[model samples]
Target: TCPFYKKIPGTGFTVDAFQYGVVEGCTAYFLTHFHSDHYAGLSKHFTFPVYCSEITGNLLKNKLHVQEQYIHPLPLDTECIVNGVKVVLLDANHCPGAVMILFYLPNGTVILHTGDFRADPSMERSLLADQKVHMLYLDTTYCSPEYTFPSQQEVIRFAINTAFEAVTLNPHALVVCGTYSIGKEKVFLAIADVLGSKVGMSQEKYKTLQCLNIPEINSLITTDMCSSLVHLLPMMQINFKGLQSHLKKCGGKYNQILAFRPTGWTHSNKFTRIADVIPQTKGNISIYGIPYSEHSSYLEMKRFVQWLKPQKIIPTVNVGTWKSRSTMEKYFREWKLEAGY
Candidate 1:
């Protein structure tokens, strides 16, 4: 969904430009996170210096197999200069290893490229909050009023509260959590911890976690499926038919399945609570759709732009259509950000 991979107008930098191939004109390639979409065209052949956070660099080297010499891992919140422009890595609050790149150009023009982020109140207290940004490469995922969703912690707590009750009723019920390679670790971990269960995943995912260096992971994850009730599988396996086949493959090791399909778009279809609606259940299988999104809510983005007040914005997502982009520009005026178009 992050489609705005075009090179910055002035700088010799291409933020998340791999899908377009490392352009001959650009000198520096900046990657915001380790997600596949953002790093699509990165391969062994492209040997430009790709600057990203240390953890993102780790994934680049370990998962994507990018050569060490070409990867430059910048420490978070630290100031550095590349190609005459000052740069800083701020926490993106998106997936693991995600960061918002802050660039201070030669003309003292401040540019903050938020790769992708969940807008938190804490961001208002940031050191760069008063930096008077000239341009903001914003993460416009869930950018409209229609995309309103709960914060990550609230959603996680809600999941924990609901899943614990389910676990208490049927302790033998298998907990299947939907996840990407690097995101949604907290959902299954919290569920497993509260329910007195261990986690089960494939060898490749386990290896990926090793690159992340997450805390208290050793005690939580396990190899054997029988010993662990909580299974963290790819988002593909969270659907009814997918889970049904998975349970079938289990050979009756667990009689019941309680699965979570966590994403922003799947959130109850409205601003609903558990008291409002019951989770979908069929044939001893219960499925809960959670708003465990890494991205910010519509109001959250509005508040962010209103507060930060960047002179102009280059939306990183949802820029494909004129209607969508025009609606975004409308919000930009409402939020008091710049839209030269």
Candidate 2:
């Protein structure tokens, strides 16, 4: 029999009870995103019918090098039957193909799983507000009010402003930025937008931008696959310590490099992991925080789980929740992102 209950504790299931079942020698599972935390486990133990949005599956296949034999590609906002359970995948709007799943059981049980979401007022007012949910399994990465964050658009603006400042201050200093290759491409594009028509992108950055299909952002951006100075994937492997050495060999020239990442619910022993990665340098290694994230902020997550009203909320991504009073309530106050019905 397939395991019908959640396998993890604090997710409305008893961890000791073997929440996962071996269904016909396979475990039927669903992947929420490509982030190492959420989807990496599938590569470790389970051989099951893994369902995900087409975009998520494509990224997994292209980027993660997963076996295609057991993968099932599904579209967003579509309902399907998985191991006799009725399930609906709703657009999460956090990352490109991020989704929130709704499970309906024969016993009239309705479960809403908010994987990772940001409050999109438009979607929440139109979609989530209409749903009738019975149980919720939510993402509470920042399930605390103290972890409130700024908006994404603002982050984009900051990236653009930073890029402009970098160029203005010292056009010759190569700017090195650290960001997730998949999501932060937008920040680079925003940097390009500020650069405008005269500044052609490095061929590497140009081709990297091509993979994105978002029209509004894509329309104004120009991309070329053959720019000599552009450094995309392979070139990214060269770190700050090796940039000057490698670029001399490649014959590439760039003024600055920028970096970004998703971080913290609040300051505590929890965020020490975040602080650990901060690069230490005395010279040209100028570091700045863009405050960008694929997951909803603390407040956004708190509000989402509040709507779910789960019996117990768990923020396993980090220890931040260790200090949280009610994980669910904490997430509700972090970011404004909501889970769809």
Candidate 3:
């Protein structure tokens, strides 16, 4: 829903330029993260070069299925110059390959773009928090007191807690749920650690993990390759509905499944099926909920901006209107980082 698009007059193949509208006569380069939302407008219309993090480049080529183009992939933390602008990619710590970009222009104008990110001090602590920054493009998706985001460790703990809770209720039962290719591997791995088994994975997510050199992956029961499929036995009942039913249909009988998905406002409407089915079951179908998310909450975003102390800040990717920017400007006035409209 990024603006700069005049009208949805006719629809067929709307390229990034058609949707985002490039800066006219501007010579500045671009740096994109692994988040699809941040780079959604790039493929069709953008013929120009793109500067991206190494992981994002790999994900674009191998995972999200984006075609090869003028992509300049740079290793993490390495400083490079693009169009006379010095640039570096900082870790976002949200997903496996997500990033926050730091750009230093010839005019000494520094802009740091935080893609969908979460606050995780464990991933990488050497942020430009000490370096001078002229502007910061932050993620404020959860920038509200209502979020009360739990720490990443706490989130992982809850995932382990939930899985154990469900398993204890029915040790014979199996579980299966959707997991992300980029993130959530650690969560499942932790659970598998407790279970004395490696968590099985679907072909797609596993293949991506393999590329990342995740060696603790000896326990999962995955298909031979991306094109192959697997079959397993269910935990108990031969025929139960709800998620288990769907899993049985998709995975067939005897396959215990554990699915992972987002919850809350973004998923309030999408998660009804689980609620509807859980009440009717004799035993609760095993499911785990994690507050773990890819976007930074409002408090975290503000704190990050304050820590960086940028000169000017422009909200990019998924920023709705100039009003959203206005609200954040007031919220983060203490940081004294100038906000742009």
Candidate 4:
């Protein structure tokens, strides 16, 4: 019914996106998370009602100034009927408020949208047990064998230890950690708890995190850069140039900065998939691109596909033509052919 918006064939319920005029006809809308890509073109002036997790809804209202009348909060693991379609929300493990959408269409087809999530064995067992998913909207962002990484916990440990090492190495230098606007709050919280100092964040990010009401993370937010030796910044500013500009803006208040980008792409190799830890330094700043991601790697995708065993697999991103379909086929054929039934 809509582009990137998973509609139940003739059913009016749409999951994610207001793309390509889908918003005009959708009976009810579901947002898996507050990621800008997923909600592109959506804003406070939107008129359609939206169903999403409590955190996502709160962000829409407080951050984007979306009208309360158009925001609907869907509790996790709870099933509700919207426009005659049964919908359930489950933890997506992608971000704080991210969710995987399960829709039981009135036509008897069960559609699962794995909205940008890291596959978890327990999540599968809890919500998918005994249920046959007819169609799966897969997050194929890393649908290539070249992408591989350790678990989130392992990566977090590495990030925390590495940051601590950097701080110890340069007591006079400031530690700058880069993260997405939404996800990876755990890393900041862990570092703060271990170092016994709050992490400074921009007011914009602080407001977004504040809506989560996660005490563990909320208490760690600080606007004063000098209050703590560690500062949290958006992922876009983690690069060498970005870090250098930030340092210049700070004048001589801080002599040095250590930056880290915790993402799966940092560990990705064009030739091989074996995971490795690598760190690069530029001028007075050092960046460690940690292999941390909320999306599944190729290996994880294969495993998830094998476990779910969906009859029809639809790639959610950048697959709208025959060439794209063929590309997906090449990447997924191995698992689809050999997946246990």
Candidate closest to the true structure, highest lDDT: 1
TM-score winner:
1
Kindly list the per-residue Cα lDDT of model 1 for residues 1-341, writing each as its tens digit: 22344666668888888876547678899998888888888876778899998888888898888999999988887789898888888898888899998888877788888888988878887768666888988888888777766567777787888888877887667889887757778888888888888888888887788787688778888777767888878888777788888888787777889888876665455667644546788888888887677888898888787778777888889877989989988888866634233
Off by over 4 Å in 1: 1-5, 337-341
Q: List the residue pairs that clash in candidate 1.
A: none
- Among all windows of 10 consecutive residues in model 1, the one with the lowest summed lDDT is 1-10
Cα lDDT, all candidates: 0.81, 0.53, 0.53, 0.78
Q: Any idea what lDDT model 2 has?
A: 0.53
Number of colliding residue pairs in model 3: 23
Alpha-carbon runs more than 4 Å astray in model 2: 1-27, 41-47, 65-69, 168-173, 196-285, 306-341
True lDDT of residue 174, candidate 3: 53
Overall local distance difference test of candidate 3: 0.53
Off by over 4 Å in 3: 1-31, 41-47, 64-69, 120-130, 211-213, 216-221, 224-242, 246-286, 321-323, 334-341
Question: Cα deviation in Å at residue 329, candidate 2?
Answer: 7.4
Q: What's the TM-score of every candidate structure?
A: 0.92, 0.68, 0.71, 0.90
Rank ordering of all candidates by lDDT, starting from the highest: 1, 4, 3, 2
Candidate 2 lDDT for residue 337: 41
The alpha-carbon deviation from the true structure for residue 276 of candidate 4, after best TM-score superposition, in angstroms, is 5.8
